[PDB]
Write a protein that binds this ligand. Sequence first.
Ligand SMILES: CC1(C)CN=C(N2CCN(c3ncnc4sc(CC(F)(F)F)cc34)CC2)S1
Length: 468
Amino acid sequence: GLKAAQKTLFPLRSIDDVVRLFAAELGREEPDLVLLSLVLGFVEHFLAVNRVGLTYFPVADLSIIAALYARFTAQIRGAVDLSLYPREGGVSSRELVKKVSDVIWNSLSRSYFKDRAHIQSLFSFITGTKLDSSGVAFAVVGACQALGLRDVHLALSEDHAWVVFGPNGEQTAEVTWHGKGNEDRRGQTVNAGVAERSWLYLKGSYMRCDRKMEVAFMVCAINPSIDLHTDSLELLQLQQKLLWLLYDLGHLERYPMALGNLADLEELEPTPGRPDPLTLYHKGIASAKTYYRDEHIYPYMYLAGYHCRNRNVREALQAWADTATVIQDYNYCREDEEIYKEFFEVANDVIPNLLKEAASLLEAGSQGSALQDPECFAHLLRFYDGICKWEEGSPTPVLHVGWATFLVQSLGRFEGQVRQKVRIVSVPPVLTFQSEKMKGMKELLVATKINSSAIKLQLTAQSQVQMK
Ligand SMILES: CC1(C)CN=C(N2CCN(c3ncnc4sc(CC(F)(F)F)cc34)CC2)S1
């Protein structure tokens, strides 16, 4: 049950009342994940899913929240008999974690669309019997906290979630699915994935949450979307205020993606007296460097995206080059397709569109253009170098001829006299290439008219040209 002290702020009548509840729970020994997720899902439902009758804020009455809480706790406590899984040393067993996962998973509707909005919270789980992938992992952690299992924590990569538990928190267990059309591995460790150096498991440099970071996760998980064209202003404000609460308490210290998510919100609607979005993106990068060996991709892609939206071509290119410098030390594995898609869209859609506008502006007499800056050309080259190096040693190739056309076009946006100014230096602007593909392309990069076919051959390592 809920404790008397957890009840005293009800009813929640406003955004600020919800923030007060989070503040109170974050001040407790162990914030109550079940309570907090039910509250966020309740308000999200009445602000984004069904706004009929809304006049200001969907009042969250204690009776309503408490009844939701009771259905959750009844469902878990009834289904997981702890006497069957004795807790050796105040820590949980793999069998117990797998049982909790099975209870959540088996509760879900047989058939539904898993990419739907607003199926992330325990409100969704109770009222709709639907959860998204990471929502299952979160629910397992909330269930384990409800059961008294203090050792079970959420583990997060940039594209997946699982749990850590056991002696010293050193065990890992899959508790949910990943992607579409991959085989369930619930109950197994993440060691194979770590060992293969996939992006999905971040070479072991994934997040191991404490309770407060699990609160940060559910706050990041708020979805203000009403439809394709419309966001709930109330939910954006809530999410923003809650992320600032977390930030001020120190709970975003080790959470790069939350910092990027906050920065994005600040760009949309700045809060007076707070750091600028750029400051926040750089704090996210610093976090990744400090805590995660600089092995995360998204801190740089958040930064690049801000510069791209602001049509700052030079800084966007630098940040994408930095992105590629991270990815180069990974192997491209099966289940890494979301990061492949991201890189593909940057290379083959976003950069081309940025450079096309830059070319039109240059024709109109822009000064200090990225297209006349050899450092910008160098960034472009370093972006491609990291992608080519990523591919090296991977079980799965990255590049194909569909990339080559866009590379030739992008290179050609820079005049030969700009491109000539980059000095490509070997080990043992100045640029060093890590990838063998770019080293062999060096020779092609300064011609007034780039040799399109030779580029193509070098990028795809195509052996032959057409017979006839
Ligand atoms: C630069 C981008 C393409 C812009 N948005 C990005 N994301 C990255 C994913 N996301 C997250 N935010 C906070 N915590 C987490 S934890 C996670 C992984 C999984 F959902 F839990 F499995 C995704 C995610 C926020 C939205 S990266």
